[PDB]
């Protein structure tokens, strides 16, 4: 077997796994007034774009033309999405980490009480 054929097969298996998980992940979100914390919401959105940037890097490479093999535009998005997760969000959530635990613990006791 050619190296490309084995490689392409590996990518094919990855996508159907990711797509099926995306199918599951989209379903639960659609299943879910409850007001959402903004900080973690951005942190969720930030890494999603990072995954898209990784996939955009994948897509750029796969094009047989390979006009931009470095995937500069895809990379820069990943750089931006990676920066916000590491430098901006993490210090804030760490400062906010205790009060998050208290509320989550607060509900868990209530849910047990309700049951």
């Amino acid at each position: 077997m050619s190296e490309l054929n084995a490689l392409l097969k590996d990518i094919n298996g990855s996508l159907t796994a990711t797509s099926e998980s995306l199918e599951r992940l989209s379903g639960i979100y659609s299943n879910s007034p409850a007001e959402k914390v903004s900080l973690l919401s951005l942190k969720n959105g930030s890494m999603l774009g990072y995954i898209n940037s990784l996939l955009m890097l994948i897509g750029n490479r796969l094009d047989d033309e390979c006009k931009d093999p470095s995937a500069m535009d895809a990379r820069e998005r990943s750089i931006q999405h990676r920066v916000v997760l590491e430098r901006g969000v993490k210090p804030l959530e760490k400062k906010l980490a205790y009060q998050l635990d208290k509320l989550t613990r607060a509900y868990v006791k209530m849910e047990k009480e309700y049951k």
């Binding site: 007001e35 914390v37 903004s38 400062k95 906010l96 205790y98 009060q99 509320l103």
Partner: protein
């Protein structure tokens, strides 16, 4: 409702102190620096708004932020300004002007329900109170001032017709405020002032408080010695506390003979232990204990004394022959010059501190520790056998 809550707080606040009831109420209400914190049980929504009882009541007084110019002037004059006990006291003892500028809070009083004592509510409140000032209670939701009566209104009112009425409930804020609601004042350290006792010392010790000062002259009314302990909140420089803790420990060891000889060996040992915990607080190795040098050892002890000490470890001598070396040995060990090589148990530590520093006789310690005189000598001999081997190893 405020009165009903006020009486409950005063039941706890007045639960345990020695007769100085009246004036404190005026201090609590009119003093601007003072603030009140109350620990409450969980609030069941099915309660219907009934006030829960207070489990712990803490009164704090913001202190510090004194201009360096005033401190030097006051220090030179020897005049003590009203309030700011800890900022002034540490400055006088340590001749440090930078400490006074630091912003800090003194826990004037902490009270817990006597029925519920030792259950850990008091420690919980201090844990939360420290947590409040550190900034960890950040608001999770995406004004409490009261307008004063204008001078125009005061002039326009007549004494005969005056309507002296309780302030409208709408204007007033809520009695109890969540820690998140009100922003804390930035602070550098938390302080406590109290008469030294075994129970109180253990309580503050478990709450990460470090001793900085102990008053030699016992209070006449109680016979207890005033002790001031400090704790540094995270995110603030901790070097100054460690320097103070080291100085206090050295001062304490010498003064065990003069006026603290009455302190039990166990109580004195705990004070040393609590101060040493400050050394563990600082991860920095810039300030560390220095192991004894060979040259320092020769200066301290002549070769004959080492021979005199060695023979005792072999049991070839009597105890009285080595009485002169004991206090110097005690200073080295509790000064940590001996190093990791020599370590002693709690009972052995108490015995060494007693003879070396308290200057108490062996039989007295036998009584104090509820041990036979024969054991105490036997324990005491084991201490020098370890010390003798260490001195051999250095040589």
């Amino acid at each position: 409702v405020s009165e009903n809550f006020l009486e409950k707080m005063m039941a706890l606040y007045v639960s345990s102190h020695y007769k100085n009831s009246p004036n404190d109420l005026q201090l609590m209400s009119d003093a601007p620096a003072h603030k009140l914190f109350v620990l409450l049980p969980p609030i069941d929504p099915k309660d219907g708004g009934r006030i829960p009882d207070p489990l712990c009541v803490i009164q704090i007084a913001l202190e510090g932020e004194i201009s360096k110019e005033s401190v030097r002037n006051s220090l030179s004059r020897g005049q003590r300004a009203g309030g700011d006990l800890i900022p002034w006291l540490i400055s006088q003892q340590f001749q440090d002007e930078e400490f006074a500028s630091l912003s800090g809070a003194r826990i004037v009083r902490i009270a817990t329900n006597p029925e519920y004592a030792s259950m850990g509510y008091g420690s919980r409140a201090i844990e939360l109170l420290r947590d409040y000032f550190e900034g960890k209670f950040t608001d999770m939701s995406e004004d409490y001032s009261i307008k004063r009566v204008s001078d125009k209104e005061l002039a326009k009112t007549n004494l005969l017709k005056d309507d002296v009425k309780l302030r409208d409930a709408k204007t007033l804020p809520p009695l109890l405020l969540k820690l998140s609601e009100q922003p804390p004042h930035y602070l550098h350290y938390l302080g406590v002032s109290y008469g030294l006792t075994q129970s109180l010392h253990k309580f503050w010790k478990n709450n990460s408080f470090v001793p900085v000062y102990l008053r030699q002259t016992a209070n006449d009314l109680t016979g207890e010695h005033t002790c001031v302990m400090l704790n540094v909140l995270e995110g603030r420089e901790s070097n100054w506390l460690v320097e103070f803790a080291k100085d206090f420990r050295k001062r304490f060891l010498s003064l065990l003979s003069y006026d603290f000889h009455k302190f039990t060996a166990v109580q004195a040992l705990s004070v040393i232990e609590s101060s040493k915990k400050a050394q563990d607080l600082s991860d920095d190795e810039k300030h560390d204990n220095k192991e004894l040098t060979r040259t320092h050892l020769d200066d301290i002890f002549s070769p004959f004394d080492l021979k005199r000490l060695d023979s005792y470890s072999n049991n070839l001598l009597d105890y009285h022959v080595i009485g002169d070396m004991i206090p110097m040995l005690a200073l080295l060990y509790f000064g940590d010059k001996m190093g990791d090589s020599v370590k002693l148990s709690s009972v052995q530590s108490a015995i060494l501190l007693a003879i070396g520093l308290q200057r108490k006789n062996i039989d007295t310690i036998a009584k104090e520790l509820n041990l036979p005189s024969n054991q105490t000598i036997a324990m005491f001999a084991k201490i020098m056998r370890k010390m003798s081997q260490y001195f051999r190893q250095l040589l």
